[PDB]
Amino acid sequence: VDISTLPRVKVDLVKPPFVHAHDQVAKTGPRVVEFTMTIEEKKLVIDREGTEIHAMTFNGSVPGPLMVVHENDYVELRLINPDTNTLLHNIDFHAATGALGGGALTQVNPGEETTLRFKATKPGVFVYHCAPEGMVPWHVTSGMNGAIMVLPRDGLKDEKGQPLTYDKIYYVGEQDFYVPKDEAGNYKKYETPGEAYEDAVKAMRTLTPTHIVFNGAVGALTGDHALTAAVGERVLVVHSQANRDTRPHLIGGHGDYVWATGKFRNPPDLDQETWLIPGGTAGAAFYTFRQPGVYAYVNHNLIEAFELGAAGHFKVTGEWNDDLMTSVVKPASM
Amino acid sequence: VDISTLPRVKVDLVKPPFVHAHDQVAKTGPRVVEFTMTIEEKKLVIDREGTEIHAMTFNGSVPGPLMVVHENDYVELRLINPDTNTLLHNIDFHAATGALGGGALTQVNPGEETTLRFKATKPGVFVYHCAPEGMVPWHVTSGMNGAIMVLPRDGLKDEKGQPLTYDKIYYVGEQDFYVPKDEAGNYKKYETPGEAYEDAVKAMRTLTPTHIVFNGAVGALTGDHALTAAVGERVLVVHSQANRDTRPHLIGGHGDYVWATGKFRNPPDLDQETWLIPGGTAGAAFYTFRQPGVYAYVNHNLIEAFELGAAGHFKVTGEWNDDLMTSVVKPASM
Amino acid sequence: VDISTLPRVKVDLVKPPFVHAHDQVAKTGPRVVEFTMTIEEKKLVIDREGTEIHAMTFNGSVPGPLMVVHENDYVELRLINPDTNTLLHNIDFHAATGALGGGALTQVNPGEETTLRFKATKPGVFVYHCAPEGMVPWHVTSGMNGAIMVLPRDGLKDEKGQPLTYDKIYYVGEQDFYVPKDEAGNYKKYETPGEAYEDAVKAMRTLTPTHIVFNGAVGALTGDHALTAAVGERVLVVHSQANRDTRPHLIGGHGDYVWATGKFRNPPDLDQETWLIPGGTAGAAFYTFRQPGVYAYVNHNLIEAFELGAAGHFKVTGEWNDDLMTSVVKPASM
Numbered sequence A, B, C: 001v002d003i004s005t006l007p008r009v010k011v012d013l014v015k016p017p018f019v020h021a022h023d024q025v026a027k028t029g030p031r032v033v034e035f036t037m038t039i040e041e042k043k044l045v046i047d048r049e050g051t052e053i054h055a056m057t058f059n060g061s062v063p064g065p066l067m068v069v070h071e072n073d074y075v076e077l078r079l080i081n082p083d084t085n086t087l088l089h090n091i092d093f094h095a096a097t098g099a100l101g102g103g104a105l106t107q108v109n110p111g112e113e114t115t116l117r118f119k120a121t122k123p124g125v126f127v128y129h130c131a132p133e134g135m136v137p138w139h140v141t142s143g144m145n146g147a148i149m150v151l152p153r154d155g156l157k158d159e160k161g162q163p164l165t166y167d168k169i170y171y172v173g174e175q176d177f178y179v180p181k182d183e184a185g186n187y188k189k190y191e192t193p194g195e196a197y198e199d200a201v202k203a204m205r206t207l208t209p210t211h212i213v214f215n216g217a218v219g220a221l222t223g224d225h226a227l228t229a230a231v232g233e234r235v236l237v238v239h240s241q242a243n244r245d246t247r248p249h250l251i252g253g254h255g256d257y258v259w260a261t262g263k264f265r266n267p268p269d270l271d272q273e274t275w276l277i278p279g280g281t282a283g284a285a286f287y288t289f290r291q292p293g294v295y296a297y298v299n300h301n302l303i304e305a306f307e308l309g310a311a312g313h314f315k316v317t318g319e320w321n322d323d324l325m326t327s328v329v330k331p332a333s334m
Ligand SMILES: O=N[O-]
Pocket: A062, A063, A064, A143, A144, A145, A146, A172, A173, A174, A175, A214, A215, A216
């Protein structure tokens, strides 16, 4: 076709774990969906100890925002690298076909911008990330990754082909960081990205992250920033990991319907306790809350969750169901 | 309903890898199934070198026993923490809905007990484990985990919906331990759990287990404690890993039908060589033995199996089938 | 039956990533397929730095060659261990049933040979590897592994049961090496395999590979040895990892149909970005190229890919499709 005859819609992205407004079932024909992201290199405090890294971000956040389109829409991304940044960046969409996912076409020095268009031909949730030749893992593990959801035009379907509709959606980006350590086990500090590079590579080559966090920091999805729901609500949690395997688990719940490797033409796995999202993948889990209270949402390597950071909370409001669970005899000395 | 109108059945658990008597197809309506477990903190020798750890157990074993119920039964667990123990414990069932899987309702100091009830609303094999706030991975990686199987009321079914009936069942719990090491690489020893805690955390944060074992120790499922079967028998092996990924493989056999992430509403994967059970999950594999002899059942990271401990044996009796395999020319010099 | 009444066919194997000529749909009844492999212990340079290891190979290559048969063919392997080698070797086929996959029947000292026959009763791609009692992971992680493909007699089928036919096939064997390091982080060197053994075990027990490579070396599948295809061609990539999990990804493409755990009686997963092949498994991915240019095929732990070696290239020829992807505004300063 002539792409110029298609409707265009502009989307202003929002900060994770929230997701820009969209419709599950497409209310228009195929569209060109316009997004803009501005790269920001910035200092970020990643843990309760105050460890501060030089993060590389799309749009100021770790992860980058979730983009949402429908199958056979076109994604048109304006990517801006302001002259206040120091490094070369680009973008690779796992949703796209050709040119290293767009990375070969989007190399931007500080002070430059570019616009890429691609057709979103496959439905699912997909990773996107920076990937500059020769320095790929350093950019990705400095936070330069996010996800895109390409919904089927008729929305999500269960294992029998009936509709699944979510009431709320959240995006959890999980980030493995590799802060260099000295012989004593202390975090080392660096004056410029160039001076950091070799020790960053050495730290990555240990294959042992120092931190594994949701939404950019230890505890980011707790307290006043806990996720929320009500009993009876249907929630979709999109979860990505651009570099390393993870295994999400909702403590006190389940994944009712899970696309662990994130691709919606496949039937979901039912009734999961824990699911494996391979590094370089996004997955999606759908759950209907049945009990109120605090839930922990974790990577179920519990060391990764509770010592390294990969844990957040839901706060769920509503009625307690004593048929589903009850204390028969509360803890006591007999 | 009124739960008080339902039948009650008490189950005395048995030590892994054996499993308490049960029926695959439910011969009664929904029931309240009563279990009791007594927590035991004890010294355990985990390897041939005589390395001794302070283990934390449900019912005296690593793993804890396998509980077996049917879908929409109620599980009523009396959990006892005798005053001979030192630590606070609780229990989180991945099978249950609400209150952190029961963990928020079951916190017991030494000298206390509690009774929890939950409805087993989802069929599958599931992990259970201790999870005291602030110290979760330490308890789990000290051995405080097991599994529960919630059978469909009409038993297991193949990928076409026809019945699969097992003749024997075994439960293999795989445990990653993190014994702290000094600069020389020697295992460190500790006088109290409190004095152990920080070094236990440091050792866990390496993400590198020192030992990975079946049934609590290197070689536990070998020799006089090898698993057994006969040619033609259908065997279900339930396998759990509460904290870390594993990849079971029967050396010389297959998983004919595998629920790698353990949930029986999904069709099984057929003809598997090796399957991935994510950390925080239980899985189940069904196989019909076709040849006699010794089999090794391993985690197929072969370093994990043969150097760190994650290997056991089957001893299978019966007829050799020369059509399936034969030596044509035995090893010789020509 | 009488196996002596069946047709015999001899196959001369070829070096990975290429695959010996075969037919997808079986043009004969069941056959005895005769293969010969000669073990070669040899020095191999594995990285750009010139690190040289003592490799243990089937047929001179890492990985060993891909064998291809059809379901219910018999595989008859003549395994030769020349007297120029030093070690004991054998072979375990994950495709086979009994005797530790053949390992109990194929133990050959230098100067010996043996012939094994087995019936290939399950369709799929499977690992084979050396497995001498007491020294299994050392042989496997020194390169002594490959794969066998057992095709359904009516070829591959999609998720709806319609035929999938590949135009080209490649075999990517991914190898984790554990070169021992000293306190400084330098690779240690050894005079005999016996003198190497304990430090090889210590290095393996770190669970941290020093190198992770395709086809035996960093960069082996690049440059003049890049994989090739044309736009519109259907390509099957068989990928094995005998010891450790991997997560393949075609940068700029997808897995249109993926058997991540490699067994063809199961429906494929569709539209994958990245898939998890557990250690001890072979998997297979089918893709139809839609854009020309350079693609990177990687393990999507990007540290493993770009720092440790697990990356190769496709060079694809043909027409660029501007509907699928285009640069709208090339990188520039505004
Ligand atoms: O960018 N990682 O959440």
